[PDB]
Amino acid sequence: MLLQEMADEAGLDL
Amino acid sequence: SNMEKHLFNLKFAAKELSRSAKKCDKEEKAEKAKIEKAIQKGNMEVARIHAENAIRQKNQAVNFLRMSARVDAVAARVQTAVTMGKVTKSMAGVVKSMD
Amino acid sequence: SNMEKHLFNLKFAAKELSRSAKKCDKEEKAEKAKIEKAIQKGNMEVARIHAENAIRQKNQAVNFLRMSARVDAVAARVQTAVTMGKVTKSMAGVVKSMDATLKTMNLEKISALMDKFEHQFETLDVQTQQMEDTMSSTTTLTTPQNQVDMLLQEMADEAGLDL
Amino acid sequence: HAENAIRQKNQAVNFLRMSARVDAVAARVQTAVTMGKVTKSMAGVVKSMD
Amino acid sequence: ATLKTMNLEKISALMDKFEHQFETLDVQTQQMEDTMSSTTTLTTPQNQVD
């Protein structure tokens, strides 16, 4: 969840 | 009295827990920052590591908050008891005088 | 305590790991730079070498980060334990003090004091009622009710109210 | 923090109740003391008038 | 060393104590409340307060 959140914040996908 | 020393001890403990929670929070913020700075460069493992660190810090902050709250409740009960004791003293004096 | 010395040791270790990771990162940047500067001149092997170096530095940085994180978790658990110990100390002190207090004071004393207070206040209320009755019986001639009623009506009309 | 606030409110209420009761008691005591002064003055007046 | 010094049975005993002492204290406070409320009844009618 945190990774998804921070990736959305930065603007990238994993 | 032992009551006063223990009250001081409890206040110190509560302040220490608050400060520890604050440190954990600052550390969480710093870790999240570093996560951003690392992912911006293409680091997954560093991100995972810092995220684990932040989770640990959050859990520990929560635990410290719970413990601090419980200690605060206890200290409050103690203050209540001490006040009641002062009251009982005053009342016994009044009893003597009025008798 | 050994706890404090070990905490200092752990903090030193974490800082050292962070600094080592920083050094590895700077070295990776420098190696990538040199790779660029060499390839710009037509060097393959130098590029391969520096790339291997950068990979090594990255792997080592990652390992240091993992180890540092684990050490941080351990240190955090230790701090938790120490705080809990302080708490246990304070609580044991409170136990001693409160046991002392409960041994000194009890509830039967409170009940006796309150029953007394009730009886004394009842006697005082009786005395005050007696005083009221006596002092009212004494003062009866020099305050008729008709004069008081007339004055009250007069002053209420003056003020502008009714009773 | 909400639990803390509730505790503080409850404790404030209890302190207010206890303070009010103590105030009532002190007021009764002042009444008694004033009545005692009055009784003294009155006994003096009794002596003098007798 | 710490675990050899301190154990869990001590913690449980301390907490059981704390519970009993706080229960006794709650009882004492309830008794005080009841007594001090029984004393203060005449000089606060409910109609006047309402």
Curated annotation (Swiss-Prot), chain E:
Compartments, as annotated in UniProt: Cytoplasm, Cytosol; Endosome; Late endosome membrane
Span list, region Interaction with IST1: 32-50
Tissue specificity note: Widely expressed. Expressed in pancreas, kidney, skeletal muscle, liver, lung, placenta and brain.
Source species, domain of life: Eukaryota
Function per UniProt: Probable peripherally associated component of the endosomal sorting required for transport complex III (ESCRT-III) which is involved in multivesicular bodies (MVBs) formation and sorting of endosomal cargo proteins into MVBs. MVBs contain intraluminal vesicles (ILVs) that are generated by invagination and scission from the limiting membrane of the endosome and mostly are delivered to lysosomes enabling degradation of membrane proteins, such as stimulated growth factor receptors, lysosomal enzymes and lipids.
Subunit structure: Probable peripherally associated component of the endosomal sorting required for transport complex III (ESCRT-III). ESCRT-III components are thought to multimerize to form a flat lattice on the perimeter membrane of the endosome. Several assembly forms of ESCRT-III may exist that interact and act sequentially. Interacts with CHMP1A. Interacts with VTA1; the interaction probably involves the open conformation of CHMP1B. Interacts with CHMP2A. Interacts with VPS4A; the interaction is direct. Interacts with VPS4B; the interaction is direct.
Family named by the database record: Belongs to the SNF7 family.
UniProt name for this protein: Charged multivesicular body protein 1b
Source organism of the structure: Homo sapiens (Human)
Chain's gene name: CHMP1B
Shown stretch of the complete protein: 101 to 150 of 199
